Every structure is written in C-alpha cells, then in structure tokens.
C-alpha cells in the first residue's frame, strides 16, 4: 500500500531526527567490524542492517508493504541483540531506539 509505504517514511525520518542521536547513531550506518575489530562479526551477524540501508531500499522502492519495512527495522535491532552481551551500552541504545519505533509503527493510520 502507498498509503503506508508513506507513513513508513516519517517512522524512517523520526528514527533518524536529532532528537534520538543519543541512542540513534551506532545505527545510522552498518557496524565497521574491521576498524572496530570485529572479527566474527560477520561470522555470528549473516544479515547485517542499520538505517541507511533500510533508507536506500525505501528510496528503491524495496518494500511492497509497511509489514517488509518493519521486518528490516527489527532485524537490525535482533543482529546487535544476538551479537552483543545484554550488559553493553549499543543493547540499552537499541531498546530505547525500538521503543521509539514500536510505538510509532503501532501509532500508524
Ligand atoms: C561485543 C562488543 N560489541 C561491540 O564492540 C559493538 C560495537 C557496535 C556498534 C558500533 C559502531 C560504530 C561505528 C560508527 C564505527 O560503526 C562505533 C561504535 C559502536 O559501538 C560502540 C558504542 C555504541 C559505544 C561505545 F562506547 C563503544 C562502541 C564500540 C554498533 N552496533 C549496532 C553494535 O551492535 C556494536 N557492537
């Protein structure tokens, strides 16, 4: 639906804003494994994702529904929940992001 390919948008746009760079940024691009270090990154992670890829397919027109778009936002959240340790700051940043996200994506008309 274009109805909600648009809404999706604004979720992207406010995931975004400057408002949640706190916790935002470690997810505005995908994890630098190699200047980090991470060397079974892409060993535990098979599909990496982060906000500038989920960008690049909405602007694709990758997703044919809000339901696609939804199942990406998620899979970069499950890849830093299945790589990390629970203690680490990325995990608390993640599920303060997610929060802004689920409660955004449930809000959606
Ligand atoms: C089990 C160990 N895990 C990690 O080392 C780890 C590092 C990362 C990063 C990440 C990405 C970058 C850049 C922009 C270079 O890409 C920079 C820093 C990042 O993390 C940190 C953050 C958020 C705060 C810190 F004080 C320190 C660090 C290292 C992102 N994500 C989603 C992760 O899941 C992840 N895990």
Known sequence: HMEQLKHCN????????KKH???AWP???PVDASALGLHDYHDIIKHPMDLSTVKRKMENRDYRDAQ?????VRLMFSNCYKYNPPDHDVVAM???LQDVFEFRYAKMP
Do not use: M, P, T
């Open 10 to 17: 604004g979720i992207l746009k406010e995931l975004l804003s």
């Open 27 to 29: 997810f505005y691009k």
């Open 94 to 96: 993640a599920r303060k």
């Open 68 to 72: 696609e778009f939804a199942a990406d």
């Open 21 to 23: 760079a706190a916790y």
